[PDB]
């Protein structure tokens, strides 16, 4: 997260850290139920040196605050038994950049570990609305991951504005969130994490998944996120949640 601040401990108890074996934090994810996480399909692609698509190559850390204290009281470690990349995920455009991760054993709910609410399919996170991005990714483009979970406040951008700023790259699954002036944005390492939106009774709903952006926090280059409401029914069909 560029332009953000240290989160308070347990402030985002649905934010999860995904570590690939021998490599540390790679992507974020969100807890949605005792058994399931949401993340970005782009985190789980094999390459020639590592089968990032193989659930057995991962560890999920729930209730995590600081990457240098992964065994703190409250932190839960879990393996994965399944990764479900969206079937329409496109490598090249990042269309349908969403994945469901099945925990090998359920999470225990606690003050530090709690699911985010999911929005119904017809819900629309309106243009202009403030929402929160969180993660352990770079705090500057080309720059170092944060040890301590970061939070940043960003706003949903009009779809037409978005398409025009990033020509031939924005599909209706995508949403621009951030600022035309830059300054606050997600970045490398935040991939797969949730946008948290404070809704009408103050409960937090997931508004999006960190997907991509051109650099981080540049003027006229807001972050691009996978919309959640579009996938409510897919999440149900695949997970029972």
């Amino acid at each position: 997260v560029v332009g953000g601040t240290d989160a308070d401990e347990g402030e985002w108890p649905w934010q999860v850290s995904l570590h690939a074996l021998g490599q540390g934090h790679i992507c974020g994810a969100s807890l949605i139920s005792p058994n399931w996480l949401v993340s970005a399909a782009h985190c789980y692609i094999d390459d020639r040196g590592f089968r990032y698509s193989d659930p057995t190559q991962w560890t999920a850390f729930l209730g995590l605050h600081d990457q240098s204290q992964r065994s703190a009281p409250g932190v839960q470690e879990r393996r994965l038994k399944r990764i479900i990349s969206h079937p329409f995920f496109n490598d090249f455009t990042f269309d349908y950049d969403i994945a469901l991760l099945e925990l090998e054993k359920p999470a225990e709910y606690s003050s530090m570990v709690r699911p985010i609410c999911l929005p119904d399919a017809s819900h629309v996170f309106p243009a202009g609305k403030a929402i929160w991005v969180t993660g352990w990714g770079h705090t500057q483009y080309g720059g170092t991951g944060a040890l301590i979970l970061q939070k940043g406040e960003i706003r949903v951008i009009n779809q037409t504005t978005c398409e025009n700023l990033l020509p031939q790259q924005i599909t209706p699954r995508m949403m621009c969130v951030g600022f035309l002036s830059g300054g606050v944005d997600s970045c490398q390492g935040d991939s797969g994490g949730p946008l948290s939106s404070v809704e009408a009774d103050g409960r937090i709903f997931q508004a999006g998944v960190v997907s991509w952006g051109d650099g981080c926090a540049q003027r006229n280059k807001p972050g691009v996120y996978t919309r959640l409401p579009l996938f409510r029914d897919w999440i149900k069909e695949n997970t029972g949640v």
Binding site: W12, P115, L118, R203, I204
Partner: peptide
């Protein structure tokens, strides 16, 4: 869901 959705609170600390």
């Amino acid at each position: 869901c959705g609170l600390r």
